[PDB]
Amino acid sequence: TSNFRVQPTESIVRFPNITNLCPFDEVFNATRFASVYAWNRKRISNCVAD
Amino acid sequence: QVQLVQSGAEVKKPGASVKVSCKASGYPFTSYGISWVRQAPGQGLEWMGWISTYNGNTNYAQKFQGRVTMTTDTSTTTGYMELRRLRSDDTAVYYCARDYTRGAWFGESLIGGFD
């Protein structure tokens, strides 16, 4: 007559971790900020953009 | 919960070197650097070392400019420290801390302290 099958109940997601976060705190929480004419430019790569 | 574990007491004699390790857990190891302070028995605190846990850059004071060396391992998130040329004035207690005064990536000074 037909085919029988069961269906999922819940759902799960797994991802590795949140490690070596990008240095956003260093840029935002710098003690002394430069002037507008001499704005400090930094390059951020190879990390997690939280 | 941020937890820091230090090694045991050392009974090293003058003319030898001391190796001490600090272990950190419960927080992002790379996000912050590692600082180490000291206190003589009966005196105030005395900073000795700082190191960024990202690029391996290290900072020392003038008193311990050429007396200590340090290494860090990100595989287990541990800090190994070698103190050389012991003297009779080196009996004290050393403490591990999470530095929030200097940046881990670029070394930019931050607003904070050992939390």
Swiss-Prot record, chain A:
Changing R32T: In strain: Omicron/BQ.1.1, Omicron/XBB.1.5, Omicron/EG.5.1. Glycans are attached at T9, S11, N17, N29. Changing R32K: In strain: Mu/B.1.621. Disulfide bonds join C22-C47. Residues 5-21 are annotated as: Disordered. Binds to host ACE2. RBD also interacts with the N-linked glycan on 'Asn-90' of ACE2. Cleavage of S generates a polybasic C-terminal sequence on S1 that binds to host Neuropilin-1 (NRP1) and Neuropilin-2 (NRP2) receptors. Interacts with host integrin alpha-5/beta-1 (ITGA5:ITGB1) and with ACE2 in complex with integrin alpha-5/beta-1 (ITGA5:ITGB1). May interact via cytoplasmic c-terminus with M protein. May interact (via N-terminus) with host bilirubin and biliverdin, thereby preventing antibody binding to the SARS-CoV-2 spike NTD via an allosteric mechanism. Attaches the virion to the cell membrane by interacting with host receptor, initiating the infection. The major receptor is host ACE2. When S2/S2' has been cleaved, binding to the receptor triggers direct fusion at the cell membrane. When S2/S2' has not been cleaved, binding to the receptor results in internalization of the virus by endocytosis using host TFRC and GRM2 and leading to fusion of the virion membrane with the host endosomal membrane. Alternatively, may use NRP1/NRP2 and integrin as entry receptors. This is Spike protein S1. It comes from Severe acute respiratory syndrome coronavirus 2. The lineage of its organism: Viruses, Riboviria, Orthornavirae, Pisuviricota, Pisoniviricetes. The gene is S.
